[PDB]
Write a protein that binds this ligand. Structure first.
Ligand SMILES: [Ca+2]
Length: 440
């Protein structure tokens, strides 16, 4: 196969940039701070459930919404014994409260019968509800986006929306039901991989890893978009043997391409690399939240990894910041280990790009604790704030099903300082578990 160069007009997480991270990550400015295990509590209202990936109800610009005097956080929860028990619950606190003990549980967003009542062919085959985002509409409605996972159809993942109907009183919030509950996007094969393409490979035992999830709502100039975890399709640089010869995925120089590509081809990571075609995708939505336009990915991670999760994007002080979480264990980069877990980040003058790496390489956060560590965190997420140079990093703490007495819970939040194309963790900025804003 001859070397070639093709960007497909999109940005790329390159091998060269990733290779810089192992040395860089030793700098405390890019490290999830150490947490104090004796301050950590289970979510008391979640009653022995694991509570992991969690997200705030947001305004269109990503700031935290105020619903009738309450903050709302949606989260995946389930029985610690059953790895396939995953539904979305809605938690809430009065605005002003900070303690983890302030979070009340409104229960599941969905009834089991809702997916059938939706009159939606894909939804009626759902077995789990995976994570997403939620926006607070201009007419005062709670608009949810999440991933419909079908365990019985080879792990199909479909971007899905619903309006959550909630009555508010002085004391409580109550979920009355949902409406406008519908599939929006299941891939198109050319821009984003679909489940059939995964099945064509031999599904799970092929080593391929199909993703179409983590839908994040954002607006710009009154246009509505989802940015999401995906994989590339046939027309924007697909997985395959040929992909290892695309210099766009390497960066730096032809010298670097020749050296790195031949190492990769001689390595035990060649096949993994060939299959690796992660992407942060984008679609525009109509005003009824249906699909308007499939758009090109903002960034892709060909050869590096198949799995870039928890897509997030927002404008802050005149620039756009794009983030994703990713496990070192599924990467193919020398010096990145199975313990390493990252939030990577990119910056643009426009929502639609082009995006270049933060801190030269893409590194924003590094967390490398043992999976057994009670203070292990995952699903790091930057919550934009109304003003200032700080965002709040939320994450879940404690691996699912690991400890009888210590469930997955809200991690202590902390601050990340962002200016220009640089970030730093704010020294001793640890907040309460699950705290969403600096303002109180
Ligand atoms: Ca793949």
């Amino acid at each position: 196969q001859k070397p070639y160069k093709e960007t497909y007009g999109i940005s790329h997480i390159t091998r060269h940039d990733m290779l810089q991270i192992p040395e860089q990550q030793k700098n405390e400015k890019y490290q999830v701070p150490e947490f104090d295990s004796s301050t950590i509590k289970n979510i008391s209202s979640a009653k022995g459930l694991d509570v992991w990936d969690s997200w705030p109800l947001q305004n269109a610009d990503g700031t935290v919404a105020n619903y009738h005097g309450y903050h709302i956080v949606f989260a995946l929860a389930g029985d610690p014994k059953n790895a396939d028990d995953t539904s979305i619950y809605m938690f809430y606190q009065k605005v002003g409260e900070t303690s983890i003990d302030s979070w009340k549980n409104a229960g599941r967003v969905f009834k089991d019968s809702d997916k059938f009542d939706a009159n939606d062919s894909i939804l009626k085959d759902q077995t789990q509800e995976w994570s997403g985002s939620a926006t607070f509409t201009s007419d005062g409605k709670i608009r949810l986006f999440y991933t419909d996972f079908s365990g019985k159809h080879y792990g199909k993942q479909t971007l899905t929306t619903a309006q959550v109907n909630v009555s508010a009183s002085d004391s409580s919030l109550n979920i009355n039901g949902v409406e406008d509950y519908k599939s929006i996007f299941d891939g198109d094969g050319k821009t984003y991989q679909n489940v059939q393409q995964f099945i064509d490979e031999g599904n799970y035992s092929s080593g391929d890893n199909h993703t179409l999830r983590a839908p994040h709502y954002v607006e710009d100039k009154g246009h509505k978009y989802l940015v999401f975890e995906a994989n590339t399709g046939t027309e924007d640089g697909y997985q395959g043997e040929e992909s290892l010869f695309n210099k766009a995925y390497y960066g730096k120089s032809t010298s670097f391409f020749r050296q790195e590509s031949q190492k990769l081809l001689q390595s035990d990571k060649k096949r993994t690399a060939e299959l690796a075609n992660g992407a942060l995708g984008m679609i525009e939505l109509n005003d009824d939240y249906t699909l308007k336009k499939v758009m090109k990915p903002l960034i892709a991670s060909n050869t590096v990894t198949d799995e870039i999760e928890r897509a997030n994007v927002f404008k802050m002080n005149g620039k756009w910041y794009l983030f994703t979480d990713s496990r070192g264990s599924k990467m193919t980069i020398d010096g990145i280990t199975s313990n390493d877990i990252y939030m990577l980040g990119y910056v643009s003058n426009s929502l639609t790009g082009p995006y270049k790496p933060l801190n030269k390489t893409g590194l924003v956060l590094k967390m490398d604790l043992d999976p057994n560590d009670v203070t292990f965190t995952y699903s790091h997420f930057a919550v934009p704030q109304a003003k200032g140079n700080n965002v709040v990093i939320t994450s879940y703490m404690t691996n699912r099903g690991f400890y009888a007495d210590k469930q997955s819970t809200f991690a202590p939040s902390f601050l990340l300082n962002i200016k220009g194309k640089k970030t730093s963790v704010v020294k001793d900025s640890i907040l309460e578990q699950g705290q969403l804003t600096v303002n109180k």
